[PDB]
């Protein structure tokens, strides 16, 4: 289906909202970019109706396994895709609308063992119509 690839990674902690219009049932591909072997991973952190206030202090220090499945919307935890060591690392999340509405989907590239150290957060503002 229709897709979206993010996103320029920085060394300072930051935020980036990005709006996306979607017809119900339509499937949205989020392509998440990073670097292999840095200790950062992409985690799906939440779906909100409220505009989310981002605090990395409060991110999970442990593995976040559950994907998001509700009556209105469903979103999956990012998953995978002499050798080059430390090259570009691709991970993919899946977004599917089931009901009209506005949804704040939150992703972040952070270190579980040091969440404040340079967390890059991506809020997708999706409209299901």
């Amino acid at each position: 289906g229709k897709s979206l690839k993010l996103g320029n990674i920085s060394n300072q902690t930051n935020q980036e909202t990005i709006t996306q219009s979607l017809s119900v049932g339509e499937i949205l591909c989020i392509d998440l970019e990073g670097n292999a072997g840095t200790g950062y991973l992409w985690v799906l952190l939440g779906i909100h109706k409220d505009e989310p206030i981002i605090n990395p202090e409060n991110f999970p220090t442990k593995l976040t396994k559950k994907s998001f499945f509700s009556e209105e919307i469903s979103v999956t935890q990012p998953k995978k895709y002499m050798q080059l060591l430390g090259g570009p690392d691709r991970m993919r999340s899946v977004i599917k609308g089931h009901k009209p509405g506005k949804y704040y989907i939150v992703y972040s590239y952070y270190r579980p063992f040091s969440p404040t150290s340079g967390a890059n957060t991506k809020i997708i503002y999706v409209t299901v119509q």
Partner: protein, 240 residues
């Protein structure tokens, strides 16, 4: 150069205990560093290996400049990955590396190569490829090994003990092998202790990760068991 050729000069005729040996205890391992958000572990691994050789062969405690390899190594791709052997070849071609006091690490921030930011530099003479089946031996008599490994998302949640996460699909990270050990784990049913072997590895995610920067990975008494494709690439810098 031949591994077998060089090993003769360092091993001799004596055998060695295959259970335990830890360079952290034999003046062979310098402080853990942090590559931060940057695909530059290939530089930390390599530089790390050289720092070890200096501590061991010359009783000199020196820490060197990864930023320089990131900036000045034109076979590699800075924050976007590289190869271990490219790293050593570039050390030789540059005629050695500045100390990181003179040339600090600034990760992904735009920085220009400048190889005259120090007067004294530290180089290597050559480097050596280690056979995937002579890891403990190379460790025992040659010192810590700059190696490749295949890491999954689980390594990021690793905190203590012997790693029990999924491995990675393909080689994608660089680290240092700095020894091997064995701990006895008591068998619930038996109440007898049971020997378990592991490699000791130095990572570059700073010291809040793993065992203060280090991870223990399952192997076997011989060290042929190589989890996560560890040691597929394996090099030791020679400074003498």
């Amino acid at each position: 150069m031949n591994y077998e050729e060089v090993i003769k000069k360092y091993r001799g005729e004596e055998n060695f205990d295959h259970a335990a040996y830890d360079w952290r205890l034999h003046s062979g391992v310098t402080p853990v560093k942090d590559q931060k958000n940057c695909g530059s572990a290939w530089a930390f691994s390599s530089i790390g290996s050289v720092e070890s050789q200096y501590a061991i062969r010359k009783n000199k405690l020196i820490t060197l400049s990864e930023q320089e390899l990131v900036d000045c190594s034109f076979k590699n791709y800075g924050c976007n990955g590289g190869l271990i052997n490219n790293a050593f070849e570039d050390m030789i071609e540059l005629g050695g590396i500045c100390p990181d006091g003179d040339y600090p690490y600034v990760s992904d921030a735009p920085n220009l190569c400048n190889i005259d930011r120090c007067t004294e530099k530290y180089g290597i003479k050559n480097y050596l490829s280690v056979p995937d089946n002579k890891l403990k031996e190379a460790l025992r008599f040659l010192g810590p090994i700059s190696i490749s490994v295949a890491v999954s998302d689980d390594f990021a949640f690793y905190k203590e003990g012997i790693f029990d996460g999924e491995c990675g699909d393909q080689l994608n990270h660089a680290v240092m092998l700095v020894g091997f050990g064995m701990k006895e784990i008591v068998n619930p049913l038996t109440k007898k202790g049971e020997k378990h072997y592991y490699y000791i590895i130095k990572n570059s995610w700073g010291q809040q990760w793993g065992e203060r920067g280090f991870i223990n990975i399952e192997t076997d008494e011989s060290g042929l068991m190589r989890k996560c494709g560890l040691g597929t690439d394996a090099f030791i810098p020679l400074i003498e």
